[PDB]
RNA sequence: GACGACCCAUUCGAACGUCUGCCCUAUCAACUUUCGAUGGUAGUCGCCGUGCCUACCAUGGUGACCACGGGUGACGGGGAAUCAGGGUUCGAUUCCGGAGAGGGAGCCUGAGAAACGGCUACCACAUCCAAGGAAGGCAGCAGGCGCGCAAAUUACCCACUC
RNA sequence: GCUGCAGUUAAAAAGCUCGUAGUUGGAUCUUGUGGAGGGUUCCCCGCCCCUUGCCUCUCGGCGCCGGCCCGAAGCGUUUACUUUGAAAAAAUUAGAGUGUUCAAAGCAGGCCCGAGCCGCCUGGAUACCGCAGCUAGGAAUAAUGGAAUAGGACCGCGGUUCUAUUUUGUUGG
């Protein structure tokens, strides 16, 4: 059965990007998916997006610009502390110059570079580059 | 292919690894202790024994020779061994009913080269080394 | 209730005495026994059934000879076939650091439960504090009982 | 086996603040049983041999003490491993000098010379209050002194002043907010500040918050707080550096700038 | 001034108890239980809490979240070797805690010992004898025999540290 | 082989289906304008609807000409997580100072006339110290909970039973 909705959303975008398609449809929608998409959009990796109401959790249509190399999920939501975050970005990123880990923290869902300014740890959700 | 990943799975992961280590051939013989009871040295690097008999063993094909060996009884267990004698003419130093120090042949209990079934070599005769006898530095005291 | 001297030796509270002088009461009467009880400290409250009751129990925190000190703990009531004692379950997660993952574990405690708590059931939540050794396996005594943060005894109207 | 009490001390097991060398020996002086705990004292031999340097060996210390030259709290002591400790006075009448034991801000006893009219009293922290037979009230201090008939306003955790010729109470300071204190244990050992809040727990330990002269803030368990003055002013003279605990970067910069240590 | 003694408080501890933490094994799946196992009431004994033990009564207590049983060339910890990141292997051994003086048991003296450079007996070794008797314990420092691949001098001193 | 292996044919998916413990489990329940530091909207104050969510005492200082105000306390449904305090032997390891002739080490050492200086200055840092227990902020994510055989609340009333034994001038009634 469907054990996790965020893993479907990112796998669906990742297969559409590799085929060269200009749009994709995500279903079911969730509060976690809308907040994750917003972090990719603010850094310039995807275009703007629209939500459809249907009285059953809803759907999203997203616009693609061709810049995204990958996006992905870490399935157990492991806890991270500021001293251990260096080991995770050494494992998951392609260079020290670009790409982002996404964390959930009591100050909100955010970019791993913002978590250092806000002096906060959290749980891992995923990444993009 | 299907490995479990859930955040409370540590008992399944830890105990499945523990169970599967017993299929590694090197791990098993080090931890059961049957190999330590079987080994004719009780975990030592060397042993002393007394020379029973001098013998020549036929080498395995595709080559042809008679390899000079000795049959030996160990002091601490009374069990029986056969051992190789290195270098040209060294069998003339050995005599019979006297002490040798013996060592492994270099492959951790397996046989070496064309010699069938020989696992050990001689290194010292009557408290003098075969190298010191062969290079003329010392002689057997009589 | 109406009788409590069920043992071969007479049962009474220490430190309470009954005068055998001025004994006249007429056509009626009043309690010949005053009741001893105490405050436990640590923000706990003494049950009404300890003050208004007539039971004898020397290991009771409110009306007997024990001092509450050291650790305060809680757990789930799971068995009660002994007399004046019960078994409670404590459940926890253990971290194994080679993996980044947890393991489920439990332990049992035998604890002393006095009268003044008389409607406890299997699956209730109970709070306990340390004592001196009270028997071979018993070191803790019940201070409070609750069924908050869970479903009712019978239907939701309870 | 251990069939009774021990009477030796290995040199790597000895308290860190004595600063003993690694290579002269296996043993260290076991402090004599007395008014101060083994972890919290300074044996008289370490003060005469290692700090003041009046003697080169333990035999040269023994023949200073047996001549009756050394007084502690105004009493002559002949024992070379006697456990001196915090707030005690040592007097050496033959050389004409007086000392008080106070912590350096790095958590070790400083040498601190004092004027002879300040060598007449000491400060004591209260440990216990109780009533004896015939209703007579008793007091106990941090250094095992027992006093009868204290003033009925003196409570737990307060500081009292005593004259050393008679051993009787002269004056006292209440434990309350705004008073000056010194820290006598933990990581904050040897710091000075004013008490600014007390936070309390029924069972387990109370915690006190303290404020520095430079405006830094620090905390510790209530058992580590010693009161030394009503309001802002201390009742004792204080050593060089006055408890301010500057950081390793500030200490580097003053050591380069002041050119001290014969630069 | 010196020495001494009943009682408080100190200092040095000792003893008993709380919470969490362990290597391999199912060709070990059920276990414990007036031969005290779990609990209650009164008592004895003890420095004191307690089935610690005795009388009477109840029928309990633990386990697939691995009990109970067996193995360990198993004394525990601070630590050591190797190591991109994560790990694997080792720790008899100078600091800290425990246990023991050929094997088991009993006890005197004392604040403190179930002590072995104290004592009494049995079990295993073994020395002297005028055959009646008497005496013994190096896993302290040197030194010897036996074992085995495998490990130093029957030297000088309280000058230093204590 | 947790990070990080493999199972059509090289070694390897129970003949097939049900099922208790174990592991895993769908969506949903309060936001934008204004000011500071910084930018050209977002992190701290105060607000559309609630900003510690409530509340009104009493032992106890403040502000002012009694009464009304602002710091404790009851406490915010219970936990994990995260960030911060406290408290944990030394030696070893990391790390600062210092020409043991260099180094491995050690904890020292450095100024000045001549001896008339009856000497002077200065070090013996600091970090790390899993888990479990203690402590104060944050509230996303993941557990957990309330009224359907209606109960929350008003300075709201009423019958009945128990009852401390205060205020009265006390000891007794």
From Swiss-Prot, chain A:
Gene Ontology BP terms: translation
TM stretches of this protein: none
UniProt xrefs under Pfam families: Ribosomal_S8
Modified residues (N6-succinyllysine): 87
GO terms for MF: structural constituent of ribosome
Localization terms from the record: Cytoplasm; Nucleus, Nucleolus
PROSITE patterns per the UniProt record, alphabetical: RIBOSOMAL_S8
UniProt entry tagged with the keyword Protein biosynthesis: no
Entry-linked Gene3D superfamilies: 3.30.1370.30, 3.30.1490.10
Keywords for this protein: Cytoplasm, Nucleus, Ribonucleoprotein, Ribosomal protein
Record-level GO cellular component terms: cytosolic ribosome; nucleolus; ribonucleoprotein complex
Top-rank taxon, per record: Eukaryota
Matching SUPFAM superfamilies: Ribosomal protein S8
Subunit field text: Component of the 40S ribosomal subunit. Part of the small subunit (SSU) processome, composed of more than 70 proteins and the RNA chaperone small nucleolar RNA (snoRNA) U3.
Entry's family note: Belongs to the universal ribosomal protein uS8 family.
Described function: Component of the small ribosomal subunit. Part of the small subunit (SSU) processome, first precursor of the small eukaryotic ribosomal subunit. During the assembly of the SSU processome in the nucleolus, many ribosome biogenesis factors, an RNA chaperone and ribosomal proteins associate with the nascent pre-rRNA and work in concert to generate RNA folding, modifications, rearrangements and cleavage as well as targeted degradation of pre-ribosomal RNA by the RNA exosome. Required for proper erythropoiesis.
Protein name, UniProt field: Small ribosomal subunit protein uS8
Species of origin: Oryctolagus cuniculus
Lineage of origin: Eukaryota, Metazoa, Chordata, Craniata, Vertebrata
Swiss-Prot record, chain B:
GO CC term (a single one): cytosolic ribosome
Residues with the N6-acetyllysine modification: 135
Disulfide bond positions: none
Covalent cross-link Glycyl lysine isopeptide (Lys-Gly) (interchain with G-Cter in SUMO2), where: 37
A GO molecular-function descriptor: structural constituent of ribosome
Region (Disordered): 1-26
Signal peptide, first to last residue: none
Protein family per UniProt: Belongs to the universal ribosomal protein uS12 family.
Quaternary structure annotation from Swiss-Prot or TrEMBL: Component of the 40S small ribosomal subunit. Part of the small subunit (SSU) processome, composed of more than 70 proteins and the RNA chaperone small nucleolar RNA (snoRNA) U3.
Protein name: Small ribosomal subunit protein uS12
From Swiss-Prot, chain C:
PANTHER family on file: 40S RIBOSOMAL PROTEIN S11 FAMILY MEMBER, SMALL RIBOSOMAL SUBUNIT PROTEIN US17
InterPro entries per UniProt: NA-bd_OB-fold, Ribosomal_uS17, Ribosomal_uS17_arc/euk, Ribosomal_uS17_CS, Ribosomal_uS17_N
Subcellular location field: Cytoplasm; Nucleus, Nucleolus
Keyword Lipoprotein part of the UniProt annotation: yes
Keyword RNA-binding (UniProt): yes
Gene name linked to the record: RPS11
Source organism per UniProt: Oryctolagus cuniculus (Rabbit)
Known partners and oligomeric status: Component of the small ribosomal subunit. Part of the small subunit (SSU) processome, composed of more than 70 proteins and the RNA chaperone small nucleolar RNA (snoRNA) U3.
Entry protein name: Small ribosomal subunit protein uS17
Modification N6-acetyllysine, positions: 38, 45, 58
From Swiss-Prot, chain D:
Residues found modified as N6-acetyllysine: 233
A biological process from GO: translation
Predominant localisation class: cytoplasm
SMART domains according to UniProt: S4
Subcellular location: Cytoplasm; Nucleus, Nucleolus
Entry superkingdom: Eukaryota
Keyword annotations of the record: Acetylation, Cytoplasm, Isopeptide bond, Nucleus, Ribonucleoprotein, Ribosomal protein, RNA-binding, rRNA-binding, Ubl conjugation
UniProt-recorded Gene Ontology molecular function terms: rRNA binding; structural constituent of ribosome
Residue ranges constituting the S4 RNA-binding domain according to the UniProt record: 42-104
Cross-link type Glycyl lysine isopeptide (Lys-Gly) (interchain with G-Cter in SUMO2), residue numbers: 230
A GO term from the CC aspect: cytosolic small ribosomal subunit
Pfam families for this protein: 40S_S4_C, KOW, Ribosomal_S4e, RS4NT
Family classification: Belongs to the eukaryotic ribosomal protein eS4 family.
PANTHER family (UniProt xref): 30S/40S RIBOSOMAL PROTEIN S4, SMALL RIBOSOMAL SUBUNIT PROTEIN ES4
Function comment: Component of the small ribosomal subunit. The ribosome is a large ribonucleoprotein complex responsible for the synthesis of proteins in the cell. Part of the small subunit (SSU) processome, first precursor of the small eukaryotic ribosomal subunit. During the assembly of the SSU processome in the nucleolus, many ribosome biogenesis factors, an RNA chaperone and ribosomal proteins associate with the nascent pre-rRNA and work in concert to generate RNA folding, modifications, rearrangements and cleavage as well as targeted degradation of pre-ribosomal RNA by the RNA exosome.
The name this protein goes by in its record: Small ribosomal subunit protein eS4
